[PDB]
Design a protein around this nucleic acid. Structure first.
Ligand SMILES: [Ca+2]
Ligand SMILES: [K+]
Ligand SMILES: [K+]
Ligand SMILES: [K+]
Length: 133
RNA sequence: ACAU
DNA sequence: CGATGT
């Protein structure tokens, strides 16, 4: 319905898909950049969006924050809910780094708890997510 | 078809 | 136009 302004928004950016992947998280209200991941040489859009959400969960938990997370990614929201990133990206030396991060993100989800609502940013109604690149 |  | 996903 309406934007929950007291929230964290995440977004992925890439050069190619697959290609160089980065992500960041911002304060939805203020646009302040709260975290930014160093570019990962090869990944997919959906792996990046998944890592961004899980990073947000870890960031908020560390700070004892109950704010929700917005993502515009139907895919990544489901992967987090399932605790399983069903990526099609081949596993090889080129993709080892992103797959390590994805494996570790799944492992974190399987060993920690959180109440953080993970909410769909409604781009069609609200425009671009505030974490946009 | 929808979300990127 | 190409790719990643449910
Ligand atoms: Ca974006
Ligand atoms: K996005
Ligand atoms: K983006
Ligand atoms: K498609």
């Amino acid at each position: 319905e309406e934007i929950i302004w007291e929230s964290l928004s995440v977004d992925v950016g890439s050069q190619g898909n697959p290609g160089i992947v980065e992500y960041k998280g911002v304060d939805t209200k203020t646009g302040e950049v709260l975290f930014e991941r160093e570019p990962i040489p090869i990944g997919t859009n959906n792996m990046g969006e998944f890592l961004a959400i899980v990073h947000g969960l870890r960031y908020l938990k560390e700070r004892n924050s109950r704010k929700p997370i917005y993502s515009d990614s139907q895919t990544a929201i489901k992967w987090v809910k399932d605790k399983k990133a069903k990526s099609t990206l081949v596993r090889n030396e080129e993709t080892a780094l992103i797959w390590k991060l994805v494996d570790e993100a799944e492992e974190w989800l399987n060993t920690h708890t959180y109440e953080t609502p993970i909410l769909k940013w409604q781009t069609d109604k609200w425009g671009e997510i505030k974490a946009d690149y």
